[PDB]
Amino acid sequence: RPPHGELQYLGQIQHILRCGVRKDDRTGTGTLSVFGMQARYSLRDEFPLLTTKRVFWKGVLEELLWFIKGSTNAKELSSKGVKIWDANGSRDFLDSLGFSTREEGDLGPVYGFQWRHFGAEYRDMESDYSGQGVDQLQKVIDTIKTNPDDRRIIMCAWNPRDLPLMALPPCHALCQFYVVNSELSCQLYQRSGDMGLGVPFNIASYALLTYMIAHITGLKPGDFIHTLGDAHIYLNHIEPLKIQLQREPRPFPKLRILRKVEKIDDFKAEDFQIEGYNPHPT
Amino acid sequence: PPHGELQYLGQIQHILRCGVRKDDRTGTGTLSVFGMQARYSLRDEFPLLTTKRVFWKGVLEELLWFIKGSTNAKELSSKGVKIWDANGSRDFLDSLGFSTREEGDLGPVYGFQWRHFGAEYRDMESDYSGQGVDQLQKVIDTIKTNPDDRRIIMCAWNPRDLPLMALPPCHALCQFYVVNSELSCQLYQRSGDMGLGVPFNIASYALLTYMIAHITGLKPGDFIHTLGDAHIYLNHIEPLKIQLQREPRPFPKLRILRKVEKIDDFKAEDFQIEGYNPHPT
């Protein structure tokens, strides 16, 4: 009787179709669009991997793990057979940014470096930043263990000084955690969200991070609150979304963590099994 | 057309029906709900709440003090506005280990992050001109040359400077965006005392959107207030329960009197609030 948590994402899509405004330009790109939306996804016994269309779960878990180790090296992930960042590591592409002296796959100070060493002077993908900058992930885990009530438990990836050094500016600007009755919640502030391709992955990433952090602090998962800045759909995806919005949601799968892990760095693709996941065909 | 203030009041009824108990740093309790959002139209109205007066003059004078880049509390209270004084007092600097600071040095707080993000902070009387990133000027430049950019953001959480600071900022980030010559703005506040602060806050950023709309030549469109921890303090449940019984009155209107071309050049006399008629309390 509480509605399926997937109807919120589908509503947001109804909405952009009914009211976005056509920021134009049948000259490649071309979008419908709306500014500011907010969705709440339960994490209690379910795990919100969308079902009306399949999400690249393997690219989810692998990219999250590549952020936790602080990497900013795209080859290092691309070897887990997740390619989503390689176009951004390609020499012609850096070459179009004056990164002419960077080795291919050096993305600059992108999420893993902002999560692990915010503030450090960034040299390049092979340097060692041990002890430099602030480690937001750790500080966040400690504050949860020792002051769950703190209203300051934030993690920021948007670093205006580092921005001209990044091979692309981040979508997720910041996430805030929050703790009550032993449940752990999370709110992601995303500046720009493609309603078709990325938003369902981005929802999985942050839910998963919430599980992993709940696990390691011995709290139980709560709500994941997805807030969006610029939410858009590309005109070319309207047809496929229009069909996609007929499909009745299917029950969200579940996720087990298969061992007791105590440091965040300690996690490995195999500690997780997504069980029950059955989405519509594409 | 429902009245803008119903969203704010909405959020009150909701925290009262579903908020859970939760304590602050000192121990005072609150009912709190995590995650909320409201949209206030900024088109030919200006949303200064009318069910309880807001200190308009603190709003104006503060935002001017943010824009100036300042982080001295004294240069604010001299305009007759004291909301930052306590955080600057000699007693308080000492409890934080800032034994070395002139009273009323707040550390690197919004002043400094909007105009000098990532400069090293020294003290309040330093000069930082050309240091760090000038996020305010950068937002206005982008609103004018690339209005469809989706990164028009300002950010005042900076983890590095957090221990240098009187208190950690409460407005973390704001984003802007433009569509049909309308300028909208979204604000992510990590924590929100629904009684005293949120209304004050909804007026800062609305006012900031009218300033940037005036200079880049667009019209104000929406202001979206997103909250991390929305909470009502306990002591306030009763007053808010009265307050919920008031029909809101039509929001007033903000008039800007001369044409200002640069954001650094606004003064408090450029601004006129008209037809403001809030209930007594």
UniProtKB/Swiss-Prot annotation, chain B:
Active site, UniProt feature: C170 (nucleophile)
Tell me which Pfam families the record gives: Thymidylat_synt (PF00303)
Annotated GO biological process:
DNA biosynthetic process; dTMP biosynthetic process; dTTP biosynthetic process; methylation; negative regulation of translation; tetrahydrofolate interconversion
Binding of (6R)-5,10-methylene-5,6,7,8-tetrahydrofolate, residues:
D193
Q: What is the effect of changing Q135H?
A: In DKCD; uncertain significance
Q: What Gene3D superfamilies has UniProt attached to this entry?
A: Thymidylate synthase/dCMP hydroxymethylase domain
Question: At which residues is Phosphoserine found?
Answer: S89
Q: What InterPro entries does the record point to?
A: Thymidate_synth/dCMP_Mease, Thymidate_synth/dCMP_Mease_dom, Thymidate_synth/dCMP_Mease_sf, Thymidylate_synthase, Thymidylate_synthase_AS
Record keyword Membrane present: yes
The protein's superkingdom reads Eukaryota
Where located? Nucleus; Cytoplasm; Mitochondrion; Mitochondrion matrix
Q: What are the record keywords, sorted?
A: Cytoplasm, Disease variant, Dyskeratosis congenita, Isopeptide bond, Membrane, Methyltransferase, Mitochondrion, Mitochondrion inner membrane, Nucleotide biosynthesis, Nucleus, Phosphoprotein, Transferase, Ubl conjugation
Q: Which PROSITE patterns match?
A: THYMIDYLATE_SYNTHASE
Q: Does the keyword Protein transport apply?
A: no
Q: What is its main location?
A: nucleus
Q: In which pathway does it act?
A: Pyrimidine metabolism; dTTP biosynthesis
Which disease is noted in the annotation?
Dyskeratosis congenita, digenic: A form of dyskeratosis congenita, a rare multisystem disorder caused by defective telomere maintenance. It is characterized by progressive bone marrow failure, and the clinical triad of reticulated skin hyperpigmentation, nail dystrophy, and mucosal leukoplakia. Common but variable features include premature graying, aplastic anemia, low platelets, osteoporosis, pulmonary fibrosis, and liver fibrosis among others. Early mortality is often associated with bone marrow failure, infections, fatal pulmonary complications, or malignancy.
State the HAMAP family in the record: Thymidy_synth_bact
What the protein does comes down to: Catalyzes the reductive methylation of 2'-deoxyuridine 5'-monophosphate (dUMP) to thymidine 5'-monophosphate (dTMP), using the cosubstrate, 5,10- methylenetetrahydrofolate (CH2H4folate) as a 1-carbon donor and reductant and contributes to the de novo mitochondrial thymidylate biosynthesis pathway.
Name this protein carries in UniProt? Thymidylate synthase
Tell me the gene name: TYMS
